[PDB]
Write a protein that binds this DNA or RNA. Structure first.
Ligand SMILES: [Mg+2]
Ligand SMILES: [Mg+2]
Ligand SMILES: [Mg+2]
Ligand SMILES: [Mg+2]
Length: 46
RNA sequence: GAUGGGGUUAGCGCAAGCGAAGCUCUUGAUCGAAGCCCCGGUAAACGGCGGCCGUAACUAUAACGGUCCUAAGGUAGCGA
């Protein structure tokens, strides 16, 4: 178990909130397999 | 000195009184400039150069916004 090194510096008011506005809890959006962000130049096995 | 208002009195009414001309006391139409008000300009003229409330990826701050006021809200630079 290693410590996550957050980008908030010195947390003052609330830790969880701070974390939430951090890269660790950034939004993740998946790449489309079909649809908009869907075009693949080369396959996984291409 | 325009007009008005008085004072005096030649004269007239059987009389309270009225009262010419003059002189005279007063009122002050009209005329009448600059100034002042007025309309602009001028700050290396004298001078003056704002508040309150909110707002961002913990927190804090607030580039941002709201509103009131002003002739205008302090620029560059500097700053216990
Ligand atoms: Mg004049
Ligand atoms: Mg000027
Ligand atoms: Mg300054
Ligand atoms: Mg000191």
């Amino acid at each position: 178990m290693s410590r996550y090194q957050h980008t908030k510096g010195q947390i003052k008011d609330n830790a969880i909130e701070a974390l939430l506005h951090d890269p660790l809890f950034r939004q993740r959006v998946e790449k489309n397999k079909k649809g908009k962000g869907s075009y693949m130049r080369k396959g996984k096995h291409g």
